[PDB]
Design an enzyme around this catalytic site. Structure first.
Site, mmCIF file in Angstrom:
data_model
loop_
_atom_site.group_PDB
_atom_site.id
_atom_site.type_symbol
_atom_site.label_atom_id
_atom_site.label_comp_id
_atom_site.label_asym_id
_atom_site.label_seq_id
_atom_site.Cartn_x
_atom_site.Cartn_y
_atom_site.Cartn_z
ATOM 1 N N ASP A 93 0.854 -1.061 0.071
ATOM 2 C CA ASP A 93 0.034 0.081 0.128
ATOM 3 C C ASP A 93 0.979 1.171 0.071
ATOM 4 O OD1 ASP A 93 -2.424 1.278 2.424
ATOM 5 O OD2 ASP A 93 -1.573 2.159 0.473
ATOM 6 N N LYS A 136 3.613 11.050 -3.921
ATOM 7 C CA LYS A 136 2.260 10.515 -4.465
ATOM 8 C C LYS A 136 1.278 11.343 -5.142
ATOM 9 C CE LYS A 136 -1.556 7.313 -3.684
ATOM 10 N NZ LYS A 136 -2.019 6.335 -2.767
ATOM 11 N N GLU A 166 -6.973 0.905 -4.501
ATOM 12 C CA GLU A 166 -7.094 0.806 -3.462
ATOM 13 C C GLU A 166 -8.333 0.144 -2.686
ATOM 14 O OE1 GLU A 166 -3.737 4.143 -2.600
ATOM 15 O OE2 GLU A 166 -5.679 4.685 -1.877
ATOM 16 N N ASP A 188 -12.978 5.909 2.571
ATOM 17 C CA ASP A 188 -11.418 6.026 2.912
ATOM 18 C C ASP A 188 -11.104 7.310 3.455
ATOM 19 O OD1 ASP A 188 -8.834 6.320 3.156
ATOM 20 O OD2 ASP A 188 -8.427 4.994 1.087
#
Lengths: 99, 385
Positions: free
Chosen positions: B12, B73, B177, B201
């Protein structure tokens, strides 16, 4: 003569608090050595690392739970004030006038 | 040690933290790093004497904010002319330059100056995770499955893959994800056929909602929505602001200018917040906080929920934008899944639950590790299980 440890700094003797507090004290002792022999201003490498590093101990102390016992409740606060005393020393030796 | 080695790891690769897990001896284990942490900050720091990644990098952040990279990211796979690159631009203490429209993080590594693309810094993070796993397994690891947000595009996904190859990883697959989260909970192994799944999330600074339709092994994204800059940090601030203001009313003094005092109050709040996720009340106590003045106060879960009523409230908007985009009505959602550390906040759960007329929440798997868990299972499946 008198075997009654009453020093606020080293009076804590319970189980949890006693250890975390005693650890910070050694930490502060090592750190203070560096501070006591520090030379530079608030922009110097050492000042920034010693500060945050002194701040990591303050944070450690804050995570201590005396569970109410007077001696550890006071030992923690005494240790906090000790760290702030070392911080004050670092600040005094590095402080420079504004104008 | 073993004679039945693990065939692959699942990673992850998170914005702020990365997590790695491996399926072995019929089970999946999340692997702890050198400092025994189940998650590793996605940080890369360039000192004048070396290069740090993970916890080491995080720790010394204050000492070198100029050369301590993170959030790569947010840039990975994007063009320098990309709008978001611009918004997030100066919001970082490190430099982010251009190069043929390819962003790069400019830092001073070992005296001179260096510049790396986003996938390069991510390859570093991935290398750490690769080594973390190898350290624990007792042998080399090369096969992996890496997760990316469901809204990521081909270029973003390819760069993530490029990032793994640069790290010596043989990337079996790049998956979403939310797909990984759904896999962790086995939402694809039921026999009920078609299922509409919504993944909530909510992390420390990123909010994502995803609706996938799972059917016969296919995970089709139906919609993605969220708040790019909404997370646990925001609930911390309110607590911080609350108490600072309270300190004023009782001591007529403002501590906001004392960086050491706020740091202690903020840390004491982050702890209070966590306590409020299991107890209805939290006691905040800091000895000699400001000018020798002690600070012994407290707060109720209810009071806390009030301070963030609007923020929690906003938690549902993305949920509705998503249902709208997928042309689905709240009643059509079969499964709900919670990922992200902030989903531990009770009010956040109740709000989502009540919204779906009391539907149960898939949340027993550590919300910080769920995605890693799912990737690891996916990696194992791809190798033969």
């Amino acid at each position: 003569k008198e075997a009654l440890e009453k020093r606020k700094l080293f009076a804590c003797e319970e189980h949890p608090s006693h250890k975390a507090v005693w650890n910070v004290l050694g930490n502060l002792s090592e750190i203070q050595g560096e501070v006591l022999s520090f030379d530079g201003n608030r922009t110097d490498k050492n000042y920034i690392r010693l500060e945050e590093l002194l701040t990591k101990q303050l944070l450690a102390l804050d995570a201590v739970d005396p569970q109410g016992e007077e001696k550890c409740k006071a030992a923690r606060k005494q240790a906090v004030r000790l760290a702030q005393n070392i911080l004050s020393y670092l600040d005094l030796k590095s402080d420079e006038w504004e104008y | 040690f073993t004679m039945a080695k693990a065939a692959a790891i699942g990673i992850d690769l998170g914005t702020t933290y990365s997590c790695v897990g491996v399926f072995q001896h019929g089970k999946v284990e999340i692997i702890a790093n050198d400092q025994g942490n189940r998650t590793t900050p996605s940080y890369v720091a360039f000192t004048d004497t070396e290069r740090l990644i993970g916890d080491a990098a995080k720790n010394q952040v204050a000492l070198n904010p100029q050369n301590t990279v993170f959030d790569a990211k947010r840039l990975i796979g994007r063009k320098f002319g990309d709008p978001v690159v611009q918004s997030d631009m100066k919001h970082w203490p490190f430099q982010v330059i251009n190069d043929g429209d390819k962003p790069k993080v400019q830092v001073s590594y070992k005296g001179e100056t260096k510049a790396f693309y986003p996938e390069e810094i991510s390859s570093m993070v991935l290398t750490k995770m690769k080594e973390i796993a190898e350290a624990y397994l007792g042998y080399p690891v090369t096969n992996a499955v890496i997760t990316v947000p469901a809204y990521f595009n081909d270029s973003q996904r390819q760069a993530t893959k490029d990032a793994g190859v640069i790290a010596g990883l043989n990337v079996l697959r790049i998956i979403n994800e939310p797909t990984a989260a759904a896999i962790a909970y086995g939402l694809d192994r039921t026999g009920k056929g078609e299922r509409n799944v919504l993944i909530f999330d909510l992390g420390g600074g990123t909010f994502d909602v995803s609706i996938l339709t799972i059917d016969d092994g296919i995970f089709e994204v139906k919609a993605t929505a969220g708040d790019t800059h909404l997370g646990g940090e925001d609930f911390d601030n309110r607590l911080v602001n609350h108490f600072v203001e309270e300190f004023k009313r009782k001591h007529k003094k403002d501590i906001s200018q004392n960086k050491r005092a706020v740091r202690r109050l903020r840390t004491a709040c982050e702890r209070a917040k966590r306590t409020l996720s299991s107890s209805t009340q939290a006691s905040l106590e800091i000895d000699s906080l400001f000018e020798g003045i002690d600070f012994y106060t407290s707060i109720t879960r209810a009071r806390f929920e009030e301070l963030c009523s609007d923020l929690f409230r906003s938690t549902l908007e993305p949920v509705e934008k998503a249902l709208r985009d997928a042309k689905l009505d709240k009643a059509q959602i079969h499964d709900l899944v919670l990922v992200g550390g902030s989903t531990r906040i009770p009010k956040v759960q109740k709000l989502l639950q009540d919204f779906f007329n009391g539907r149960d929440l898939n949340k027993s798997i550590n919300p910080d590790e769920a995605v890693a868990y799912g990737a690891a299972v996916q990696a194992a499946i791809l190798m033969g299980d």
